[PDB]
């Protein structure tokens, strides 16, 4: 009856705040708040239906409140309890998602244990100190993540480039093998030994070059494996921190709300 004391009456919280509370919740989840217009006596009902938050205006004129044209209810609490037992079919022929699960403010005031303003103020400090610290670390991690991602991309391109390079030096061998075959045969017959050695010497030079390039690629293949492992480990660390960080902020954010709550207001 007391609308101020109503479980689902949250007052002046913004649409966004309601979105957070209705995030990924089951159909039938509802709460009532002041209209965004802040007009003194209009309230807005927010109902969860089919993955979406509905906004349903609650019309306030003369003595009675309601959705549709015939203001049939004399108080706000009347309407919600009379939509809490039944379906929504009498606001609209369609719909009929009722009103099932509310959003209570009392399970939320559970999480601030302390009564006095000093204990709450001390804990707010602690959480907020932990929060900025953990945020800073998550951001450091995300830069390392980003840097590493780039470096891995660079290295992958560079391994490809090694591949192309190596093929080309291997084609040079093959090209040398084709031409020089007939020349060394004939050269032997013409009795020139050290000309043969010059050809073989260039061929040795080419093949050892190939060995260098292949081993240099081999090394870069190693470095990539290592970094690929570090990248996944940075991803692990971020996935542990992230959920704890969100919950940490949500705690801090309501200690601040609690601190505001018993504290001098306009």
């Amino acid at each position: 009856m007391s609308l101020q004391d109503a479980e689902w009456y949250w007052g002046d919280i913004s649409r966004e705040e309601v979105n957070e509370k209705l995030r990924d919740t089951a159909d039938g989840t509802f709460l009532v708040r002041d209209a965004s217009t802040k007009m003194h006596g209009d309230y807005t009902l927010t109902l969860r239906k089919g993955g979406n938050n509905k906004l349903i205006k609650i019309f306030h004129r003369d003595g009675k409140y309601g959705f549709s044209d015939p203001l049939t209810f004399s108080s706000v609490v009347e309407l919600i309890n009379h939509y809490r037992n039944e379906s929504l079919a009498q606001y609209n022929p369609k719909l009929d998602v009722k009103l099932l699960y509310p959003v209570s403010k009392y399970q939320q005031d559970q999480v601030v244990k302390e009564d006095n303003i000093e204990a709450v103020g001390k804990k707010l400090h602690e959480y907020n100190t932990q929060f900025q610290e953990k945020s800073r670390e998550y951001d450091r991690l995300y830069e390392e993540y980003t840097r590493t991602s780039q470096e891995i991309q660079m290295k992958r391109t560079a391994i490809e480039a090694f591949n192309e390079t190596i093929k080309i030096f291997e084609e040079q061998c093959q090209t040398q093998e084709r031409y020089s075959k007939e020349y060394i045969e004939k050269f032997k017959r013409e009795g020139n030994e050290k000309e043969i050695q010059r050809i073989m010497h260039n061929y040795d030079k080419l093949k050892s070059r190939i060995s260098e390039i292949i081993d240099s690629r081999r090394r870069l293949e190693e470095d990539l494996k290592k970094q690929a492992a570090e990248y996944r480990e940075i991803d692990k660390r971020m996935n542990s921190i992230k959920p704890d960080l969100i919950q940490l902020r949500k705690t801090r954010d309501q200690y601040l709300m609690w601190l505001t709550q018993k504290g001098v207001r306009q």
């Binding site: 089919g50 205006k57 900025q132 840097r147 470096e151 959920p243 704890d244």
Partner: protein
Amino acid sequence: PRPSSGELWGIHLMPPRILVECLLPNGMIVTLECLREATLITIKHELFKEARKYPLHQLLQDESSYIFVSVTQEAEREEFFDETRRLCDLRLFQPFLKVIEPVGNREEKILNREIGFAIGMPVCEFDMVKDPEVQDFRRNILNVCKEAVDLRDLNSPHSRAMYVYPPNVESSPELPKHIYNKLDKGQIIVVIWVIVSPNNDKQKYTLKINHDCVPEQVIAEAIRKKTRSKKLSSEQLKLCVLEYQGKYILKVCGCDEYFLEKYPLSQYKYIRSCIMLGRMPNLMLMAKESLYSQLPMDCFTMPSYSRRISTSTKSLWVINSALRIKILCATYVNVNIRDIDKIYVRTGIYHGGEPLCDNVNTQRVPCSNPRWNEWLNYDIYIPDLPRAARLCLSICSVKGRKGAKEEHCPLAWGNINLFDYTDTLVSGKMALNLWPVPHGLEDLLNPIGVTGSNPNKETPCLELEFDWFSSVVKFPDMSVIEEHANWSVLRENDKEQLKAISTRDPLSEITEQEKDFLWSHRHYCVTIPEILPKLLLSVKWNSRDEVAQMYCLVKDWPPIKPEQAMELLDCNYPDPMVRGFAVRCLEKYLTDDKLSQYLIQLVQVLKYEQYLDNLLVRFLLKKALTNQRIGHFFFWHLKSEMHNKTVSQRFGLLLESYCRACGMYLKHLNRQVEAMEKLINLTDILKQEKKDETQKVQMKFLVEQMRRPDFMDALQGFLSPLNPAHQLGNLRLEECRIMSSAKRPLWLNWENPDIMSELLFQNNEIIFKNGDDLRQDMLTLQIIRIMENIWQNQGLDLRMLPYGCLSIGDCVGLIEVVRNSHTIMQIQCKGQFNSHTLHQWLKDKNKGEIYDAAIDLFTRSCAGYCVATFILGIGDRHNSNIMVKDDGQLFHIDFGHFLDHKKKKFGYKRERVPFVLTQDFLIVISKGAQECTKTREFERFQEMCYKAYLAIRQHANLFINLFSMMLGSGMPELQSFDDIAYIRKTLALDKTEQEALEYFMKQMNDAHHGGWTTKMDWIFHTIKQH
């Protein structure tokens, strides 16, 4: 942690001599020692001289029979046809060159290299790709290229000149009265300059003409004063005027900006600026031919890929089934087994940002074994699927440790179009490589995110299977849909409410009552066409019955203002008819001026397109290829994001077509890109190898490098990417330096090669910055410019200073230097500073009669930044990020945070006043008065602020829309509509206008501790005083 991007792989700069392995056609290998700056002509010549000493020499042809081929850092095997290029500029992977005989299509190979250089990617990669959609795009987009190139040569030379040098003009001729009153009897003094032969003397004629004079008339007027000393019959005279009126064209002195078009002179942005500033316009007259000879001949070739060979149907509406999708398995996830309990796959069916039914999870399974084999049922009927329907999924982790409370975090996400670009309903098995969760995104899905498989194939891979109807299923054609709508079949109170709903902002809450109300009255809605976005959101997009009906409305819908039409291109309106409609509005009503102004956003919403090929991309490309000022920024906004793998396939395909058809501008863009790449390499050396060294040592290294011939070539004689109308000539090496700031920015200066450069733009000073993300500043500066324009058009002269800021790459950018301006901190540090130091400084700089003007300028500038930074919620100002010009103009620099950023990490719900006017500023504004808030000057400043605030508030739609279009942009500070909710608060959109002003006054008082008064009564807001 230091791989190197430079002249070779793993090295930033080649040493002055370098050994280079040369592979001859006979199989031999020769090691040649080369100068790092040597050209290929030289290197080839040396090689073939040396090759005489090696075996099998006789099998070698003439050295002019061969070119060099090698592997580049992009892993392309590249043939070097241009032998004038220096070795150090080749981007070799390793120092070797292979001798080959040139083959294939030489002109196409050369064009493709130039294209690939511009866009940062070899275009051969495109030929590889298997996706039908990609190859279809590359082919069909050629229609748009040919259309534009024909529409270019139509009228030649004039139409080609209009392309290269478009009119830079306001969107309307009409003059605000604060501008008009600056005119003397509706007339403007202009100075026309001519360069006269043989000796190129500069002669000055001064004219007084009607502001609305067409440039042809201005030329005739100059002809009149010129031939006036000579006396002649008024018949021969104006026959002489007529005949030679069109033998000349007008140009701005100092930059390449032309008036080629019959717009009124005061409509050209340069002239309009001159008027508002009481600056003398200086124009240069020249013969029409000396310009049209400058014009390159642009020719467009069909590419070879337009010449190549390539590779049971049921309606979606006859399929009677519920939507059913199967999650099979994921390859891996990165999770710490000890920190999480189980993992699972979240899914949803989305149209835009809205679910079409509620979300559905698979079951939870152990981290170590990501397998489901689960058919998920969705509550929707396959015929009820809208054309834009997407599948949005994520692999999520769940941790159950504290009481009954759980922590759900997304590991990876992906989105899929339920229909492909041929309108085929997807079916069968599908494999999706997933994407990293965007920084700051806490939601379990990411429907805003792009569709498609992550091109990186070492990523979590999620196998899916869609249902098969034993036929290929297509979306029903328009004829069918159109028919089904015909198969369906108070007023003053209603009319007012309808209007009243249409006057609200995009992000205004719309109740279920109002949706039904809107939908019911939808036919009358056409009477107020701009209600459309709101009517579209009232539609139930999971019912084919309502959509079919809405399609018939759209077909016949009256166009709406571009500023409104643009909302329909944001992430909330995925439907292809709706977007089509929006684009046809831009076609009819969007001036090139507005298109340039909003280009940043229009490019960004391209990320929201379901398919490569769409009306929006064709329109933009077309505009980009018929206007080169649009073309310039079109290119740099796309290229700056090419490092980002979400968009790089799309943008690279768009950049390729653009570079094919853009003509000779490609040569200029490549010169710009080459110049930036030397600046990136240079600053990478400074930030990596030289990172521990003194400024003095670093300054010695910067100097020695800038004198290098290959560096001079690249950094001299190109167009400025900030304003391509500014030509960058020779470096002034003595004014170039590394700034003391942390990321080691470079302060650069160039000669203006313009012959008239003394009159305006004598210095081009640019800060090149590598290592900070400039996208947020760039947006902010753009918003400031759009604000300044709004105010001017209302007759409010509030002089902002949106300096040039351009992001060219990943965390790399250019800032335009503002001349003769210093920070407040710099000021306080010369001339011991009390609160009066600033006003004293500004006094010393303006003495005598010009003193008042400097105060006036500082006051107006002040007002504008006070209002804008309030509205946008800029990072807090201080003496280091606020600057002042010697003539008194005040402006802000280094924005770098805005909107709700502070609320996220401190949890305080408040609106900051970022710019709080310290006594120092009040003193200046009050001309040194003892009590500063009581002066009439300060009342005047207040009214300015008030006016400025309500003007922007009146335009709230525009700004909100512009921000909405940035949501998928990757800016951590703007990630969803909640970030935009901030400006709804600072603009008090949920209040009345009078309430909003009261609110703005209150914010100023709370921040300044009193002193903001009202010239109005509390009740009616009517003038009481005076």
